């Protein structure tokens, strides 16, 4: 693998590419407000792809976008064939954002691509960046949702709410995003899978493995939009 590096925003180029990169960051950080026709819930991309200093997708083990562009096109079992990064992003809109995919030449999609390409600067095409994806966490026993409920009340509820509905900020964006219910990710999302949610809870955002497994189980007992 190669190291995860974040380029300097002060070294962003003047001109069309630089402006596109800045717009892409905003689309990724503020998606429901910037792309209402395509987003069907309360989530922005940064809610599962966080980053420090205003950037999105820069955190190891929380599915960073650093180096993503050089890994596409790639096989998708879901599609049964190779897909492009544009198509992957469309799947995220449809599932994680309970919405509608952008056209593959939509200027907002191209701005998102430009941003991801900027984050990927210097990464060799084909190389895997250390900390890519969300590592799954799988235990050799059933997730105990009863224990999970107790853990949730003690460790998560203060942010994500008794009803999993999250906490809005003053500008109507989610400070702490919804974990279930109508404004959360739909059943088609990767985060709706036990081992992915457990891995995200464990590494993506301390908890023991057993605690992460059980609380993920509790979270996933709840209703959310059907895909």
Contact call for residue 183 and ligand HEC (CB under 6 A)? no
Instruction: Give the interface segment with ligand HEC, choosing from 3-11, 17-25, 119-127, 132-140 (CB under 6 A).
Output: 132-140
* Torsion angle, alpha carbons of 67, 69, 75, 81, to 10: 170
List residues in the chain that are followed by a break over 2.5 Å (C to N): 205
Q: Which of 20, 201, 203, 224 binds ligand HEC (CB under 6 A)?
A: 201
Which residues 6+ apart lie within 8 Å of 24 measured at CB?
A: 111, 112, 113, 114, 115, 116, 118
Return the number of other C-beta atoms located less than 10 Å from residue 57's C-beta: 24
Is 49 part of any known ligand binding site?
Answer: yes
| Residue 14 or 121 having the CB closest to ligand HEC | 121
Which residue bears the tokens 């906490």?
A: 167
In angstroms, rounded to a whole number, what is the distance separating the alpha carbons of residues 207 and 215?
Answer: 10
Return the number of other C-beta atoms located less than 10 Å from residue 34's C-beta: 16
| Residue 74 or 142 having the CB closest to ligand HEC | 74
Contact call for residue 133 and ligand HEC (CB under 6 A)? yes
Is 160 part of any known ligand binding site?
Answer: yes
In the annotated binding site for heme c, the residues are 45, 48-49, 156, 159-160
Please give the residue ranges that form the binding site for ligand HEC (CB under 6 A): 28, 31, 43, 45, 47-50, 63, 68, 71, 88-89, 92-93, 96-97, 112, 132-134, 155-156, 158-160, 176-179, 184-185, 189-191, 196-197, 200-201, 205, 207, 215, 219
């Amino acid at each position: 693998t190669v190291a995860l590096t974040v380029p300097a925003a002060a070294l962003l180029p003047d001109g069309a590419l630089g402006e596109s990169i800045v717009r892409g960051r905003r689309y990724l950080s503020d998606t429901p407000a910037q792309l209402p026709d395509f987003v069907g819930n309360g989530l922005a991309c940064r809610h599962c792809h966080p980053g420090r200093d205003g950037e999105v997708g820069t955190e190891a083990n929380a599915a960073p976008f650093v180096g993503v562009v050089g890994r596409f096109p790639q096989y998708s079992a879901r599609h049964g064939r190779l897909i492009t990064l544009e198509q992957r992003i469309g799947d995220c809109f449809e599932r994680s954002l309970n919405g509608r995919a952008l056209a593959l030449d939509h200027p907002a999609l191209i701005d998102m691509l430009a941003y991801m390409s900027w984050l990927s600067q210097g990464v060799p095409v084909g190389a895997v960046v250390a900390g890519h994806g969300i590592p799954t966490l799988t235990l050799e026993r059933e997730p105990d949702g009863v224990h999970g409920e107790a853990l949730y009340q003690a460790r998560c509820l203060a942010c994500h709410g008794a009803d999993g509905s999250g906490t809005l900020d003053a500008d109507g964006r989610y400070l702490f995003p919804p974990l279930w219910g109508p404004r959360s990710f739909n059943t088609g999302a990767g985060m709706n899978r036990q081992a992915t949610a457990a891995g995200f809870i464990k590494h993506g955002m301390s908890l023991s493995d057993e605690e992460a497994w059980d609380v993920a189980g509790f979270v996933l007992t709840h209703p959310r939009p059907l895909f």
